[PDB]
């Protein structure tokens, strides 16, 4: 009941001091599927109020942990003190194939480990020496990135100069990234800062090179970090459809694939939030058009395959229908087995910048209803694409606070919650089935047809697990 939700919101806000109350009220809203300009209902991408326990991360997380970290054959230096690189070492499951420590380096933590003397004198000389050491001990790395942590900009270091000098000296691509954590208000600005760094130091390397033989079916997967193998289970379908995937940005990605992307015919954007920046740039500079797609669940996947195929000739469209017919009996069997076990169950989600709206279709393919959703750092163009996907009178929350999330959950009483690691254990203690929707709870892939089977199996094992019937001691 729209009234009941509006009332819930106001009740929850009562605990806040005046300033925080007025601000938070603008980030909470009752959905109206008719709205197309989300700003009329909710504001986003603003700073978080102090002391409220936001679930958000920083720009470094958005640049190092999200965009750059996954590029497998490059060495990424967490530049600054030891903290940042250690907490983010192998925490995100951006899968890849490689010989780690030899030609690939994703799971390792390279850092300049700033000590007090580095703060006093600056770390540019340390950076230069570090680079020579990286070159000596990891000769097969194909490029280096410098991910700035908070102190870099604060002490006035000039990492751009160091990168230029060492880059020319070693004939190596060295990318300075100003993703210090104090910039922006969340992981989002980190994405933008990272996209601009790729554009300015990597993307135009082959602008004058014509040795790449292109075909009219060349595409690039933009914005899929291959969580649990998500990109590979996406790539397989596109190629079965007759297309040729030249690059993957950036799950299991190589620096060469990135440098080859300007030669593709179409950029396929999955994560709009993190890579719409570089996508717009490629259209502007190379004339490459880009389109958004969704590989979550059979309905969205079939719709996406068909929309993508329509961009090419009839032969691709024919293969598209052959691929859809091949998998039809597989996902129908998944639905046949699991939908009756999940039919009608209600889910509340809270994620980053894409999935909060992107997974709705998959839940509906299993007869489930998303009664609440929100993003940690989405912008309003994200909410514009969200309201039409959510049901009337469902709850929306931007940069939700720990307190808010807990209170909304106690009132709404979802049958399942899909959020992050910092949220997981809170709700399990409340007896509410919980599934991690960032790390897929160490399961996955969830993208495509093969991913749908796993997703269904996972929602079922958790929601209907026998443990949820045992939280109350029988002598109570």
């Amino acid at each position: 009941s729209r009234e009941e939700v509006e009332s819930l919101i106001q009740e929850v806000l009562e605990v806040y001091p005046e300033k925080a109350r007025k601000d938070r009220n603008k980030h909470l809203a009752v959905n109206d599927p008719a709205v197309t300009q989300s700003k009329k209902c909710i504001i986003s991408n603003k700073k978080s109020q102090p002391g409220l326990m936001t679930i958000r991360g920083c720009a470094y997380a958005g640049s190092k942990g999200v965009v750059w970290g996954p590029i497998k054959d490059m060495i990424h230096i967490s530049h600054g003190p030891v903290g940042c690189g250690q907490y983010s070492r192998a925490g995100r499951r951006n899968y890849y194939i490689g010989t780690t420590g030899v030609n690939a380096f994703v799971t390792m933590n390279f850092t300049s480990d700033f000590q007090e003397k580095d703060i006093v004198f600056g770390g540019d000389k340390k950076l230069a020496k570090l680079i020579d050491e990286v070159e000596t001990l990891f000769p097969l790395n194909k490029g280096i990135s410098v991910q700035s942590e908070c102190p870099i900009g604060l002490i006035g270091d000039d990492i751009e100069s160091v990168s230029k000098v060492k880059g020319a000296e070693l004939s190596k691509t060295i990318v300075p990234v100003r993703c210090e954590g104090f910039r922006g208000v969340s992981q989002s600005l980190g994405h933008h800062i990272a996209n601009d760094a790729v554009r300015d130091w990597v993307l135009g390397k082959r602008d004058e090179d014509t040795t790449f033989a292109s075909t009219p079916y060349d595409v690039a997967i933009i914005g899929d970090y291959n969580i649990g193998g998500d990109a590979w289970s996406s790539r397989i379908l596109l190629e079965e459809m007759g297309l040729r995937c030249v690059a993957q940005w950036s799950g299991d990605g190589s620096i060469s694939e990135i440098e080859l992307t300007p030669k593709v015919k179409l950029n396929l954007v999955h994560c709009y939030r993190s890579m719409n920046y570089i996508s717009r740039h490629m259209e502007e500079k190379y004339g490459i058009p880009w389109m958004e797609y969704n590989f979550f669940g059979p309905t969205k996947t079939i719709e996406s395959l068909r929309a993508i195929a329509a961009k090419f000739d009839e032969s691709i469209q024919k293969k598209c229908e052959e691929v859809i017919a091949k998998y039809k009996p597989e996902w129908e069997a998944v639905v046949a087995k699991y939908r009756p076990r999940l039919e009608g169950k209600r889910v509340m989600l809270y994620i980053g910048g894409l999935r909060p709206r992107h997974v709705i279709g998959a839940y509906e393919d299993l007869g489930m209803e998303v009664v609440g959703t929100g993003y940690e750092f989405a912008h309003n163009d994200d909410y514009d694409r969200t309201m039409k996907e959510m049901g009337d009178s469902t709850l929306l929350y931007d940069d939700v606070t720990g307190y808010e999330f807990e209170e909304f959950v106690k009132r709404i009483k979802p049958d399942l919650i899909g959020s992050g690691i910092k949220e997981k254990f809170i709700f399990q203690k409340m007896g509410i089935p919980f599934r991690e929707m960032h790390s897929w709870d160490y399961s996955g892939p969830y993208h495509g047809f093969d991913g749908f089977a796993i997703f269904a199996r996972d929602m079922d094992m958790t929601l209907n697990n026998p443990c949820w019937k045992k939280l109350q001691a029988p002598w109570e």
Binding site: P17, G51, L52, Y60, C84, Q86, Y327, A333, I421, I454
Partner: protein, 522 residues
């Protein structure tokens, strides 16, 4: 493709032939990958002594460190006080990381807030963030105490915690009597354990600095116990159990055992148990104060000895037989309580276990890492077991600590092949286990990548990992274990000998090849 009644997750899904062909094409067509023979050549070179020398002369690059930053330790320390909310003044990204890091190790909620200083605070400081932050935090989460620490951004720009908090109170953002102990915890100085020490001394000074004239040493008849950065629930527990067993009055200063282990009974408890504010105020009235991990409690020690006037005993961490004996005897001496028959019997049971397993433990070689106190305690027990601690690595260790460990080693023939390394990381350790191969590695989850690396050279070069330390993210509930006292020694001994027997069983499981030694009895 998927078979609905046997769904495959990433492993082994991607092993299917169609996925395998697809990955081969991705590589050949767009990765411009180095030839496999070149990759083998470099990999081999990374296992050599020549590479190890180059590796050890690094001066600027750090690879796979075995330490974290200060505020992580400040948050854990704060978490051990009644209804206390850890608050880190600075950038919020840090807080998302500290929580996540502890959430994965304890598999429990971890509450902590930030005052989200952003770019516009980088120039003029975060005084406003502190005012609004403390007010919003107290109002929203209702803690009875807010313990303040800092991120590197706040440290670099010079925010004065003392002044910022005083002004927040002076201007009415939080009650003047509301406890807000604080500590500067720069990530570029020491490590996470230093943050624990800083935060603790900060809370201790907040509740006792100005009222020392009211204190009388020994008047409350208790013994204070300061645990230090501790991530094993059984360690807080075994100390309280042994003291209660002895009838010794005590006060555990920073006790997070309840809040790191709440029951799943239908409700989320943001706060639970913990050292009370009254216990901190009363602490100076104790007979004495015992520091369980002295190598990372130096600032606390100076304050406890210099201001509380406690004759802090010179005791090593209570790990292993000798050191647990010493701890009990000292506690007995300070409290006047005798060591009871039950503890004497427990000691004898650990010794029995040592006599029963010594043949499999004798001469086994180990590489190990972790925090200073934990590492030296592990080293001492290994020596007591007749094992050889060959590669001892403590990234956040120091020169005085190394000398102490070198002395412990010189006191035993089993310490002859050991070398203590400080300031070195897990990439340095990786070279050591390839050039001077030990039988096992005792360390945290990051060690799994080293095991994987050694297996690649060959099954006969594989060095299996035995998980003891922090963090442990790839196994469940090991945070419930114990490493201190006789109980912890029994657990570690059991884990070590069975790790040896498991590997031996693996190597003798070859039908008609190595199974002649696949003994039913060992």
């Amino acid at each position: 493709s998927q078979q609905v009644d046997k769904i495959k997750a990433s492993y082994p899904l991607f092993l299917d032939q169609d996925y395998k062909d697809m990955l081969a094409k991705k590589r050949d067509g767009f990765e411009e990958k180095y030839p496999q023979d070149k990759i083998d050549e470099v990999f081999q070179w990374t296992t050599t002594k020549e590479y190890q020398e180059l590796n050890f002369q690094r001066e600027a690059l750090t690879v796979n460190p075995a330490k974290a930053c200060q505020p992580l330790g400040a948050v854990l320390c704060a978490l051990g006080f009644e209804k206390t909310m850890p608050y880190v003044h600075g950038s919020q990204g840090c807080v998302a990381y500290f929580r996540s890091y502890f959430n994965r190790h304890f598999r429990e909620p971890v509450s902590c807030v930030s005052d989200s200083m952003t770019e516009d605070a980088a120039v003029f400081g975060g005084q406003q963030n502190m005012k609004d932050g403390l007010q919003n935090c107290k109002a929203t989460y209702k803690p009875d105490m807010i313990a303040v620490s800092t991120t590197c951004m706040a440290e670099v720009i010079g925010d004065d915690l003392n002044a910022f908090i005083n002004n927040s109170k002076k201007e009415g953002f939080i009650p003047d009597e509301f406890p807000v102990p604080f500590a500067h915890t720069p990530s570029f100085v020491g490590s996470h354990v230093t943050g624990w020490d800083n935060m603790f001394e900060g809370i201790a000074r907040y509740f006792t600095l100005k009222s020392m004239d009211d204190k009388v040493v020994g008047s409350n008849k208790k013994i204070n116990i300061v645990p230090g950065f501790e991530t094993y629930l059984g360690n807080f527990r075994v100390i309280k159990r042994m003291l209660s067993e002895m009838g010794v009055g005590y006060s555990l200063l920073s006790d997070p055992e309840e809040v790191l282990d709440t029951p799943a009974d239908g409700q989320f408890r943001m706060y639970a148990g913990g050292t009370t504010q009254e216990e901190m105020k009363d602490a100076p009235n104790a007979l004495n104060t015992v520091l369980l991990q002295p190598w990372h409690l130096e600032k606390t020690k100076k304050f406890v000895e210099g201001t509380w006037k406690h004759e802090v005993p010179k005791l090593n961490i209570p790990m292993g037989l000798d050191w647990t004996d010493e701890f009990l005897m000292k506690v007995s001496e300070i409290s006047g309580q005798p060591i009871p028959a039950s503890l004497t019997k427990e000691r004898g049971r650990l010794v029995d276990m040592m006599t029963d397993s010594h043949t499999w433990l004798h001469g086994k070689r180990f590489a190990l890492w972790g925090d200073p106190d934990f590492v030296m305690g592990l080293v001492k027990f290994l020596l007591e077991l007749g094992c050889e601690p060959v590669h001892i690595l403590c990234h956040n260790g120091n020169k005085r600590w190394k000398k102490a460990v070198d002395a412990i080693l010189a006191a035993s023939p089993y310490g002859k092949n050991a070398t203590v390394y400080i300031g070195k990381d897990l990439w340095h350790l990786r070279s050591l286990v390839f050039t001077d191969k030990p039988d096992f590695m005792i360390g945290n989850s990051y060690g799994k990548f080293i095991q994987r690396d050694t297996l690649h050279k060959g099954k006969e070069f594989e060095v299996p990992l035995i998980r003891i330390g922090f963090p442990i993210f790839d196994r469940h509930h090991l945070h419930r274990s114990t490493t201190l006292g006789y109980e912890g020694a029994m657990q570690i001994l059991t884990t070590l000998v069975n790790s040896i027997l498991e590997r031996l069983d693996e190597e003798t499981r070859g039908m008609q090849a190595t199974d002649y030694n696949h003994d039913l009895v060992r």
